[PDB]
């Protein structure tokens, strides 16, 4: 067994692990959303650009949750990442829809992941996800929460030089 | 004749040639949306640079074949430039589809030479086609698949607010 | 429906896909091989930092090929990233040997998607793999043959001081 | 009494005295092995420099907790350092097994403070303590770990070739 390894419960590594394995889900979402926003017939450079950002974020964000795994004496221990759910993402809105009801997903588990960390009584755990995954989170949802009503804003019969306009003034 | 010349097929040296004036072709082709698309009644100066990009990369690409063609001492052997094919290129959209098909088909002359090059075997031309063509094509038929998304995406009953929002924001 | 693919067939757009996929579970099987090897009854850190540096790289591996996929008009298709081979690699020469083993199989997955693409009669697909993959995967397996043959040589009647000695004075 | 003093309880209060005690011993003790490891017999002065910093870590820590004990109106109050608990520490390993159990040990004084802390609902005390000294611990219990893991790896048919091997190529 670990020779480090100290508060840091067996539950609170599997839910670790868990939120690993989902935030890994989230990097290749936003790696297929990524590329399905920079293909031929879908060509929103700013907005393949945006979910590129996200995937590099989310990777960052497991790496950081497996250095930690690593630094509490746990087991880092994989399970297959699942597929994007779609293989076609749509509009501008219903793909952003879709990022941030997974990003929403991923503070749920995070929040539930705290939760858990405060029950078990292990301070690291809650101020690793307090100093750079519930913040991350925050300010990202917000931030797709801005886009997404700029999107709506945007809609209606105009509908595709919403998507234009959004992509080249917010999305540089 | 050649004293240097070495593998290079006389049907290789005829397609390179055939090559040259496609890419003279689409370089004069690309002058002439070039010193359309700045015309008073067009008004596009992005889609008018946009174009005069494109004949200097087509003029790149004849110098560079022509530069091939006497590297493997082949004669470059100038055919008369066909004129554009029309003197009057439409909507942004409508010579924008213009270009991209042009493009299409500088592409299939190459993976045709390519082709041929290959049947030919021919290592050096496949080499160069494949370094500084192909890729190049590849490419700008990206870039022209991109904003042509965009210029449909943009179309509507109005349709001109497309163009002028096209060719600020995407056109530098 | 793709406006600019052309000469891409549907067969090379599959096998470009299940190589992402081999990239993807790759880019997996490093990251479990380098948060194996900094994980606290492991305590190699340039092990750990030498596979995570080709976590890195077979992701830009996917990532390009992804670019490359939508450069030709492609479909960027997902599917599941399986879990990597092992949750425990063993010891440095036996995770050595399952990257090794890993990246002989990508370079494989590479040469077959090579023949498809010559026998489809793709230059640029041709092109693509053999600058950006074929060059980086030999560099790459002869790399870890040195390190599995310095690991051989270490390897021997204490093992641990030929494990620690490689990982101080090659990797870092 | 103090007149800053809000939330803090008596028992918070006399928890980070003895705290402080222990990061006095603490660093005592790694005075202890700081100076032990450069004994002309011992000869390790890469592992001296290590407990060095450690002694310097561990006086970081009670300065800042005496200075967040005066921050928060609590009164410093000062007990025995108890003397360093051996004075011939042995081997490396067998010293840095002492010093890892020690880590542990303040680490457990840590969370049984952040536990009380919690329990009292002193939300500064719990910042404090995540953010400067929850994390070190927990990074200084891996650190050490890992040097415990290569010292275990390189405790080969001699012993002092790898403890050599350590301190020159590991403590730097």
């Not at 994007?84 to 829809?97: C, H, L, Q, R, Y």
């Not at 949802?141 to 886009?147: P, R, W």
Request: hydrophobic letters at 35%; one cysteine or more; proline letters at 2%.
């Amino acid at each position: 067994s670990s020779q480090i390894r100290q508060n840091y419960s067996t539950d609170v590594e599997a839910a670790v692990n868990s939120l690993v394995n989902l935030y890994l889900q989230a990097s290749y979402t936003y790696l297929s959303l990524g590329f399905y926003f920079d293909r031929d017939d879908v060509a929103l450079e700013g907005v393949s650009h945006f979910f590129r950002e996200l995937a590099e974020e989310k990777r960052e964000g497991y790496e950081r949750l497996l250095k930690m795994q690593n630094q509490r004496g746990g087991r880092a221990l994989f399970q297959d990442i699942k597929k994007p759910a779609e293989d076609e993402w749509g509009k501008t809105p219903d793909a952003m829809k879709a990022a941030m009801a997974l990003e929403k997903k991923l503070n749920q588990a995070l929040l539930d992941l705290h939760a858990l960390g405060s029950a078990r009584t292990d301070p690291h755990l809650c101020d690793f996800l307090e100093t750079h995954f519930l913040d991350e989170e925050v300010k990202l949802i917000k931030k797709m929460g801005d886009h997404l009503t700029n999107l709506h804003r945007l809609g209606g019969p105009e509908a595709g030089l919403g998507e234009y306009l959004f992509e080249r003034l917010t999305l540089k």
